[PDB]
Design a protein around this ligand. Structure first.
Ligand SMILES: OC[C@H]1O[C@H](O[C@H]2[C@H](O)[C@@H](O)[C@@H](O[C@H]3[C@H](O)[C@@H](O)[C@@H](O)O[C@@H]3CO)O[C@@H]2CO)[C@H](O)[C@@H](O)[C@@H]1O
Length: 241
């Protein structure tokens, strides 16, 4: 079974938005090199939070491979414009990123959190997937606790989707393991690089089209970057005042 490896990642690194198919991103197919595979990106600009994964393509079947045996994106900065080489070893699933200007990201300092989602009218202030929209910056109400409120939302199911994004980009984000309804009125654990959260207020007991006020709280007091574990949220829904 013939396997083709593709570097998928951010548009700024790869020229495509997380495209893992050889026919769709032929420039990012990795070349056979000894017992491993290599892809060099020419003159990558100085920048922060470049991200990639290696995608194994065997016919229609895709396997997305993240950092050092995890499902995390490989995340690095480039200090000075340089050629970045990505190495992949099928025997170990080791991904290496090398180059004079390359520095691996090994920690996260949160300076902002954006609520990002399918905004319309009062829902996320009308912003459609705006990762850096100031109006959806959560307020830091204490050390590592963030809150935002959306008032006068029409109660609906399968209408409202959202995630949390740190530092006005997608490098550090939270959602759920599968795209599914958020727990309502109870603290729940968040998945780093997770799927969209659904805010299904009819299923939460608020009559369709009735107005509700939504209060979202994000607690990263026990978030550990090394494990990507410990971020928690609460989504409070109340009849509108
Ligand atoms: O731009 C609209 C788009 O925004 C959101 O997608 C972002 C993801 O939430 C975010 O995690 C990241 O997703 C990539 C993963 O990091 C990566 O490991 C791999 O799985 O590819 C993912 C992209 O397919 O970046 C995207 C933005 O490109 C939102 O969740 C989407 O519903 C929405 O369409």
């Amino acid at each position: 079974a013939d396997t083709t490896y593709v570097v998928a990642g951010t548009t700024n690194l790869t020229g495509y938005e997380w495209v893992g198919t050889p026919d769709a991103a032929p420039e990012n197919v990795m070349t056979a090199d000894g017992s491993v595979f290599t892809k060099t990106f020419s003159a990558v600009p100085a920048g922060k939070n470049y991200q990639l994964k290696v995608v194994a393509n065997t016919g229609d079947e895709q396997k997305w491979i993240g950092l050092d045996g995890t499902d995390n994106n490989v995340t690095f900065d480039v200090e000075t414009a340089c050629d970045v080489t990505v190495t992949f070893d099928p025997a170990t699933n080791k991904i290496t990123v090398t180059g004079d200007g390359v520095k691996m990201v090994t920690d996260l300092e949160v300076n902002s959190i954006t609520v990002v989602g399918n905004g319309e009218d009062n829902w996320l202030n009308g912003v459609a997937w705006g990762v850096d929209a100031e109006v959806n910056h959560m307020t830091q109400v204490s050390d590592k606790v963030y809150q935002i409120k959306y008032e006068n939302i029409e109660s609906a199911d399968d209408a409202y989707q959202f995630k949390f994004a740190a530092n006005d980009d997608w490098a550090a984000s939270w959602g759920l393991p599968e795209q599914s309804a958020t727990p309502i009125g109870e603290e729940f654990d968040l998945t780093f690089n997770g799927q969209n959260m659904l805010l299904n207020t009819v299923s939460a007991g608020f009559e369709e089209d009735s107005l509700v006020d939504v209060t979202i709280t994000l607690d990263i007091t026990n978030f550990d970057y090394s494990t990507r574990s410990g971020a928690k949220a609460t989504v409070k829904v109340e009849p509108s005042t």
